[PDB]
Design a protein around this ligand. Structure first.
Ligand SMILES: C[S@@+](CC[C@H](N)C(=O)[O-])C[C@H]1O[C@@H](n2cnc3c(N)ncnc32)[C@H](O)[C@@H]1O
Ligand SMILES: [Cl-]
Length: 270
């Protein structure tokens, strides 16, 4: 089961434009939440820009595909910026995709605050293209310890199968963010931990399927895809992305790495 991974530096719309309809199983999306100065030539707000890649993302997703969008709920109203809610409202009005879950990523540490409740969460909006979306709950269930598992097994009111398979991790994930001394750190300011991406990849895509990330950043998605047996396409507009991707690889089974948007097909093949 040799997987293929293509990467390149380019704008998200240029990546998406080269991808055929219903060719991708899962999209990992952790977008910037502000437009560029030049973007003011064609847009009046964040969504005016974001709607373009959101529509394109839905197009390349297969009938069984899903997209996980990272974002916060602290938007302050600045012109040209927005947050996950700006995206969700837009989707409710213009997209047929189903919001399967609004996941809360609750991290342990963070800054303090004297005038409000210290922020300890970030969200993940999981949109499924259709009601036939793929979902592998068993792949992400959290096992019970032997003691607790033994107690439940004695409770005949409970289904023994559910017990041995573990519990649903729920839509609130208590996971840590990366620290400045983390091993997987590559230098990217908003690098996401492999742990969070892994849960998304295992539950929202099947083995050998294609995972797409057009705001790849640190390239963590490709690393996870490779470790999980999926194919992947990772692109970012920042040239430095190439350095991070290469770094991700050093942290690493049969897989092939291919550079160049002209080779996207290599990762689309089942
Ligand atoms: C929040 S970061 C993604 C971080 C990623 N989840 C990680 O774990 O490293 C957003 C990324 O989008 C890129 N970006 C911004 N505008 C873009 C555009 N028009 N096309 C492609 N990438 C863009 C930035 O360079 C940045 O790396
Ligand atoms: Cl929910």
């Amino acid at each position: 089961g040799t997987t293929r991974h293509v990467y390149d530096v380019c704008d998200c719309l240029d990546t998406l434009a080269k991808l055929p309809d219903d060719s991708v199983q899962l999209i990992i999306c952790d977008p910037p939440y502000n437009i560029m100065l030049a973007d003011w030539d064609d847009h009046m707000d964040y969504i005016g820009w974001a709607k373009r890649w959101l529509a394109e993302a839905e197009r390349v997703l297969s009938p069984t595909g899903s997209i996980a969008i990272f974002g916060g709920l602290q938007y302050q109203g600045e012109a040209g910026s927005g947050d996950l809610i700006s995206i969700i409202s837009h989707m409710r009005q213009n997209s047929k995709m189903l919001l399967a879950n609004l996941i809360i990523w609750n991290y342990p540490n963070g800054m303090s605050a004297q005038r409000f409740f210290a922020n300890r969460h970030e969200e993940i909006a999981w949109f499924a293209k259709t009601k036939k979306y793929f979902f592998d709950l068993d792949a992400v269930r959290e096992p019970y310890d032997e003691e607790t598992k033994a107690a439940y097994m004695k409770d005949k009111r409970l289904n023994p199968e559910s017990v041995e398979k573990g519990r649903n991790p729920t839509n609130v994930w208590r996971m840590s963010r990366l620290n400045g001394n983390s091993l997987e750190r590559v230098g990217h300011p908003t690098q996401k931990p492999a742990a969070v991406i892994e849960r998304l990849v295992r539950a929202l895509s099947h083995p050998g399927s294609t995972v797409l990330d057009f705001f790849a950043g640190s390239g963590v998605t490709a690393r996870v895809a490779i470790q999980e047996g999926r194919n992947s396409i990772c692109t970012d507009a920042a040239p430095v992305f190439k350095e991070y991707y290469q770094k991700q690889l050093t942290f690493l089974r049969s897989y092939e790495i291919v550079e160049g948007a002209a080779n996207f097909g290599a990762a689309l093949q089942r």
